[PDB]
Amino acid sequence: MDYNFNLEHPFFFTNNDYSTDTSIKYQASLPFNWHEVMNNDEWVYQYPIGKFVERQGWKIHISSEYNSSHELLQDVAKICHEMRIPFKHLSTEDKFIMRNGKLVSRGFSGKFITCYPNQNELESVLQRLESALKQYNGPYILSDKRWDEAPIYLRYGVFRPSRDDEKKVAIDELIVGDEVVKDERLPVFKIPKGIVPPDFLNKWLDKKDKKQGDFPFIIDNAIRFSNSGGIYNARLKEDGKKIILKEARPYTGLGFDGTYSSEKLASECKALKILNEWSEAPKIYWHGKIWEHTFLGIEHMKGVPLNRWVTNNFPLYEVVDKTKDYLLRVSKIVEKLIDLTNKFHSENVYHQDLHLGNILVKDEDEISIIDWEQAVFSNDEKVVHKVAAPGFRAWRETLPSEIDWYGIRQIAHYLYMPLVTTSDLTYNYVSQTRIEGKKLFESLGYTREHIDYVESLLSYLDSKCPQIENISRKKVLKPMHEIRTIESEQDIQDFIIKLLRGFTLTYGQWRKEFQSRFFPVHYYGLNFNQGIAFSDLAILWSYQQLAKKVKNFKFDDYYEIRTQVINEAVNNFKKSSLSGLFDGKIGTIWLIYEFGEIDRAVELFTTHFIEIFENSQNKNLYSGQAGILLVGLYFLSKGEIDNKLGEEILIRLREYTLNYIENPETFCKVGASDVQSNDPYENFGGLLYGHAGVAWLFGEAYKLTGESIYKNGLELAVDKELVAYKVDSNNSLQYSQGHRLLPYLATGSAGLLLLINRNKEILSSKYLKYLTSLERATDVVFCVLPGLFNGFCGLEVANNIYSDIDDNFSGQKKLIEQLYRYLCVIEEGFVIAGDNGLKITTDIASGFAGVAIGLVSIMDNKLTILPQI
């Protein structure tokens, strides 16, 4: 459920073309001399044949409830088929669920039938429609104004695109006066900039009801808004008290089953009425009905949520935790959860939504369960668990009491090893965390008795949930049961063979039911097809680079798919509109060169390099100008081009260096930043984004020829980039971004540790003193993401890469024996869930290609994603 992002669908993600069918339509009984047009796959528009309509005017908005939705069509279309009024309405029932549901914005809420009366015939339309319906009801629809006692709503808007015999006016602008005015969609009603109403509307606009003002609330803030309402922070006006305010507009907040927000609110009110003697449960101070929004106020608990408490108390370092004392607190919290669950299961209530956002941990380790919004009060049935957090949803129908135990089991397993995200893809995934948390806690060094007590508690929690037969089309994905220990190279060969076999299995399931791409990919780059990024050509390149390290692979269908990928990559080369190393046209040239194609790469290179270099805008490594110069310097260093083109490349590289040394602040961000996200085109700090990409180019230019201005620019860039870094309490240098610290390969600490290790012979003694500080920041024991750009593989490919030692067995052993906690299997296979596990993907940032490049770069000591020499 919970679509949008991009969508549902087992295993892979997909584009926004999957919401197909299976709901009954509305089908409003067309007469003759008319016509119905299905245009935007949401609305059917009926035009009377041979009638001129007027641009702008006053639209008519009609709302509806779910139970009596089918009667408004037969009572409004009967009105509109006599005379001549064109109207449009929704087509499928699913979009009627979604339009009045929880997900959509407050601007588009409740629009179900829209009428288009003309200017001189609106009187009879409204006078007939007021006495026509008179009994049905629905939501208010914001950004509009009500009529007297009907679901009729009015608005001044646009009717249709511009006529051929009129001035060309865009959809977003009006024609009031001689000026064009862009309209806005704000939740309150505003007359759009002085449009003169007709004489009959002045009575309906300018009137005022009774001014009896008695509001027993002082609203201070509002933490979050929704379609149902908002959750305010206020105080009572009796004497004092801090209250948490909830509201729910009538006939909205609708779910896929027929159940509104008021029923959930009343269930919350009853459930907190029953539990009215426990300090570790909220209490109700006020229940009422102001106008028709049915306000509820409940008391405000104190503490931090368990999600922040895990990150504040898990040992992420060997030195961050002192005098042990962590597992006994976990056992105490699990014992409190068991006691609470038994106590409110004895009182015949069922909380039915137990995830990390509800348990609040206050001072001295006391819990308090909040958000009793989907409570039920009967246990003899078998229902489907409908609304849940990601990773806390039950499987294949159960009793209303076992959903609480299924929640509590994974809350306890998250507190032992924080990886429960992929539990919506693999059944019984937490057994892997149960197995592999014990190895981590033994390697850190702990008393045995705490481990036995915690494992006894997890066994007791496992014993009170039923094993359910997995029939959900996701049966193939099964967790591990046996974990080995790597002691020789044959285990590494076996793991490599299993990983390529898992890639072979995950190719076919994507290619069987889709054809728009060739490999599945994370949803940030669902529409990108070029560069060292979310793509498809780097997948085959990493597959070749890993398969060359294993002797005599099965070699299924390699050459055919290589032929179509290498043909399709060059077939649409100039149809793109981006230029850059990692996301543009110059990256695929280097990858085509990396397969081979020595004539083809030079033929594309000499034809398109000048046009690619002139139209570039930015000046960073990821999508700017430095990557194209790096590719040109690589091609000059190997040598496949003419002398004058290389002279132009060197002249423009000197021009770039001279522009950089004058003012460095033009094309970067020297600061600390205030926005935190995983978006690729939003971060400006790191190796891919910022000064380290410039320093890599300066190091390559110094290694090519040897001008001292490149060394000066590199030293200036390194001294500028270390301004953004801070020092924590553990004496470690980390990148700073908002309230978060990011030691990672791409956007953080490991990029500089790789860069100053690559140039140890050129740099001097005033710059190498940060290596001990940076190595203490990339020695973590656990991180959530398994990827290459911002995951564990990026941390371990750069911690021991160059080192002037050929000892590579220890790094491979550590990487393989610690990366086992992120995987599942398929049939003698191996697939890796990517950032935000709830997926399987093959892409270079978080997936198969990232760990393939990690193993290849650990073996060959090159980091084969940035060109060098």
Binding site: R106, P187, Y232, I290, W291, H355, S677, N678
Partner: peptide, 24 residues
């Protein structure tokens, strides 16, 4: 409570105090 109406209607503005889409 009568003649209120406008009150709540207005209420719908205030101002929040200072990823993972798809609701919960």
């Amino acid at each position: 409570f009568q003649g209120m109406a406008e009150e709540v209607l207005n209420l719908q503005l205030v101002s929040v105090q200072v990823x993972x889409x798809x609701x919960x």
